[PDB]
Symmetry: C3
Subunit: 456 residues, 3 copies
């Protein structure tokens, strides 16, 4: 047999695999789960394209299902480049503000325990990358209207680098200032949904058609480009979500399965709530994207709460986030803008309803179901520890002020450069073109090239 | 460091999460597999939508693929409400006929050995919850022509409470009475396929178009609304069925993988059997829904058997089920109904053909591969325990009489209330016309409401 | 409790399961991960049907997505029949050239430790059978134009028997002659990709339409039947590939997750490389299938490498395989053949690029991360051992010589038996130009029978 004669470092590379069995630090069952979960979280990336392409009331030229592969490629590459480092490095340079570049090019990402200690660096980095790929596929879907492909890549890269990563460092790193503060966030109310959501708002305001003919009064609330596309994307997203929330436990203990039950319940309820609110708000008619929008809403709602709150409380978290989001979509008719408040009214707002409600129903008797793997939490309002709701709004503010600020800067800087302008203004574009090659899901038959925006 | 000081209870909640590592009664590898097996079982719900929406010789007003997220949401919620309780509670009400309401609202559910002791309560409930949502979707597809969406919600919820859960407790509860009798049903050939399949038959005979014109002598047998929908339906369902059967072993032992192999070989032979039977019955032409209909008929046939029967017998089961089901589709041209019997000829007849054949080929040596996790079965007819076919037939008839009677009562009772009758009669309806909105998979571009039947 | 009073045998059936707990030889977590990864690999089979039906510049009468359940059904069966035997028999019939038929009809495959000792036969046979079905699908892929269905079945069954199974014996069976020579092939650079690729090249030269109109000078290089098919096929494939490669570790150790991170990075870099090359070769226009084709190319290139090479080299293997496969599609316009050098230029050419570059970057310390489960390697050029590239080339030439020789003998044989002729010549064919029923994915609506070639 191959015999080892060394002890794991518990730092850096984690040890020498030639002389040290780095797997003894970890459980094979915890790894075999978070490994499968990784593959499962990724199938949410094309589910996010299928959803928001299909929900949109404007045909997009850049197919969002198609683009979601480019979102995978430049996010998987940004994560390898310096992404995993800037977020989840073992050493940070602030009050815990952003990581260093010790993990550039995935240098020394091998077998040391991560910020989740039940898992080696390389398995955590794989898992957490899909979270980035998910988020960056959302940010893509909020900013895809009349987008240009290469400035879209550059935008995504830079956005993930200077917006998602520092916020992930705050919330999920073992040394992030919001983790020390007390901000609870299971699977990314703040990191994935609040970030992508509000950059979707910051898109709507800075770019994106103002005074949009699709938002005029008396124009329908739902005119979906493809119902099928909305329903397929929810199948992938709901399925992928059991792994998104399940694996955030970091292990295979009761806590992971407790949080999948909370995840599906808050889905069912959030769905059934939206479906029905719309039934009344639309006059005894059953909406066609009503259910599916509700399902997603209740899933964003329970994202930050999944591994903290009681099962019954999920029902509450799904109903409030369903309703709150159903009403939030109506904000499209006050600004008279469409792009891309679709992403905002479900992820930005659902992210906030969730991160608060998280700090209300947060129980210690749920979190301890990870037993032996526990990183103890003080409790929430249902535990008579009342000041947790402030620790959440602290997270909600930092993650919001930073996204809303830096995304604004990023878009406007990219706008001053003609070579990188994300979206063209109508006076530049060859407006009105052979855009009949879209395309229920992607593009019409024998379409060899994507119909990109041109100028003059 | 943090330590735990208290022994698990083995009753009720099974322990105090805060003074008992509840996990120490279960293997993290067993749990992590039934956890992912859950999410896998769930992706069958829209597969059932797709497969029967697309196999239909009729445009359905209610898109089955759409209606499957609705069948997820009211089943997940019914499971949480009192579903897990009525079917799987630790104490039964007399003889082992139904469970108590001790798990109402998922009160008192976690870290306690369930009815499969290798799994806690909260995980066996998540896993088994998906089996509910799969039968909900099958009851849907059989009972959905001209169906109204809100009676259909109310119908599932009720059908799932007074038909599924009692038969579930009979066969899968530790204390159930069909367990004690000797009835073998690995993964639901009694609970899932025979019950939803026969609620299809009950639908065809009570509601659903009598003397349907699609069934006249000379009119074609197959004529699929959408072949793609059938095939992507089979893709999901087969994917799919591997966790459905594989996780029913309750553990990750050799037994799980012996039963995944039997699953795919029965599918492979159900498929080729139906496909080649159709080739000779249709005058030497390869049908478009023959292969996929045999794959599902074969997967149904092996469903009660995958964990007891030798691999080689999966061939015998796939070939006989796919044949018997092929004939059972011809039942439509004798009854002159359709509405109906697709969800019956595959699941109803398949579930029966399956469960009888489990009594004939069950082997003591195959069940035993579970190792230190076994419940030792005497075996079946090839172990010369002739008395097994009878216990299987005893299980069929118990499950068959309680479904035909209570679905008949539930459909007639509901047929008497204008607020809730599932399907409007031919005279109070108003055809068509919204077909121009259906829909290869769901609904046409920019549809906003589902074309619910309204009365004159 | 049930007590076990026997010891595992090591051979045949592994022991009597009635008196031995065969599970004690194996780790549940390892078995669990490779069991889920089985079903994950399966979903790659319709991905190959979706991907190559959409890439085609010719619309095919036999839908690859439809026929991919046929590839699945007859490959499962050929595995049960004698495929697992011929490839992974414990006793190879000299000198590690092909197995025996000791596992015929899956006799004795159960609990013995397989050719990967950390997994029982029955689980390793399930898992590896999916690699077969992936290959049978890729071989159906490149040989479907104007294919006849029953000859297509018989061709797959024999091609899987006398071409896939020997080569799998040589490089994967524990006693195989390329194993003991030194050839590294992690997850199927030779057995899966190089074989089916080169079988496409052999088809294209022998049966494919010579002097095809779609390849005359100035005819577009890309004219995809369906961008949506290409994108959905990549979603299933890229999801499934994480289990394809990750499960090739044979276990849940850090080597499995290290290999999944290589897999994704090479995909990402293969997609962007092709996408950017296409951009500059098609004159500043972004190709509609470029990004995806490079994703599949990169996943092909890293297939033999994933478990042996440093993460950073996945960038190199991705760019070189992306670019190399790009160039190779231009071969269609030198031979003036289309069907079916689509499969050749990604799988054939990517197999060889991948397997060579595996010998250059194999690293003893990456392989060593499986810790207690390794058979150590010297490594390749970067460990300063230069014999490894030799062993790679030896494996390439054996695999290439065999499939190019035997596929030709097999195609030319069948092509001389009127009723087994795979593809009718344009002079005996009826040429019913009813391509009107050939849909985007499968068949149009109410299509009933597949359109098989007939003769005047």
């Amino acid at each position: 047999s191959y015999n080892f004669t060394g002890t794991p470092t518990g730092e850096g590379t984690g040890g020498n695999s030639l002389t040290t069995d780095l797997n003894t630090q970890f459980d094979l069952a915890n790894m075999g789960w978070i490994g499968v979960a990784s593959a499962g979280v990724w199938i949410m990336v094309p589910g996010i394209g299928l959803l928001y392409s299909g929900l949109s009331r404007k045909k997009h030229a850049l197919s969002l299902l198609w683009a979601s592969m480019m979102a995978s490629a430049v996010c998987i590459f940004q994560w390898f480049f310096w992404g995993y480092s800037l977020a989840f490095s073992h050493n940070t340079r602030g009050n815990g503000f952003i990581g260093t570049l010790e993990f550039f090019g995935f240098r020394n990402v091998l077998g040391a325990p991560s910020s989740v200690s039940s898992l080696p660096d390389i398995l955590f980095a794989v898992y957490q990358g899909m979270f980035a790929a998910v988020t960056g596929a959302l940010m893509l879907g909020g900013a895809c209207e009349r987008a240009r492909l290469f400035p879209m890549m550059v935008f995504l890269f830079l956005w993930m680098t200077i917006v998602y990563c520092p916020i992930a460092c705050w919330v999920w790193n073992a040394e992030g200032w919001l983790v020390k503060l007390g901000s609870l966030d299971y699977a990314g109310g703040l990191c994935v949904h609040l970030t992508s959501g509000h950059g979707g708002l910051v898109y709507a305001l800075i770019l994106g058609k103002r005074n949009d003919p699709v938002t005029r009064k008396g124009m329908p609330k739902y005119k979906p480009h493809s119902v099928t596309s909305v329903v397929l994307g929810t199948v992938f997203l709901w399925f992928g979500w059991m792994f998104f929330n399940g694996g955030s436990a970091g292990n295979a203990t009761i806590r992971a399965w407790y949080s999948i039950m909370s995840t599906n319940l808050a889905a069912a309820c959030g769905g059934l709530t939206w479906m029905v609110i719309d039934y009344f708000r639309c006059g005894r008619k059953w909406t066609t994207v009503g259910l599916c929008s509700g399902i997603i809403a209740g899933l964003v709602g329970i994202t930050p709460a999944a591994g903290f709150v009681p099962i019954w409380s999920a029902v509450v978290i799904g109903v409030v986030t369903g309703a709150g989001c159903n009403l939030a979509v109506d904000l499209k008719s006050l600004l008279r803008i469409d792009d891309g408040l679709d992403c905002y009214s479900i992820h930005g707002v659902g992210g906030c309803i969730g991160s608060v409600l998280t700090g209300i129903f947060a129980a210690d008797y749920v979190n301890a179901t990870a037993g032996s793997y526990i990183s103890p939490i003080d409790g929430g309002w249902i535990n008579h520890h009342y000041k947790q709701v402030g620790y959440q709004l602290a997270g909600i503010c930092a993650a919001l002020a930073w996204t809303v600020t830096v995304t604004s800067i990023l878009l406007l800087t990219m706008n001053a450069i003609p070579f990188l302008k994300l979206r063209l203004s109508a006076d530049e574009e060859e407006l009105g073109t052979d855009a009949a090659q879209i395309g229920e899901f992607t593009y019409e038959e024998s379409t060899a090239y994507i119909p990109e925006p041109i100028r003059s």
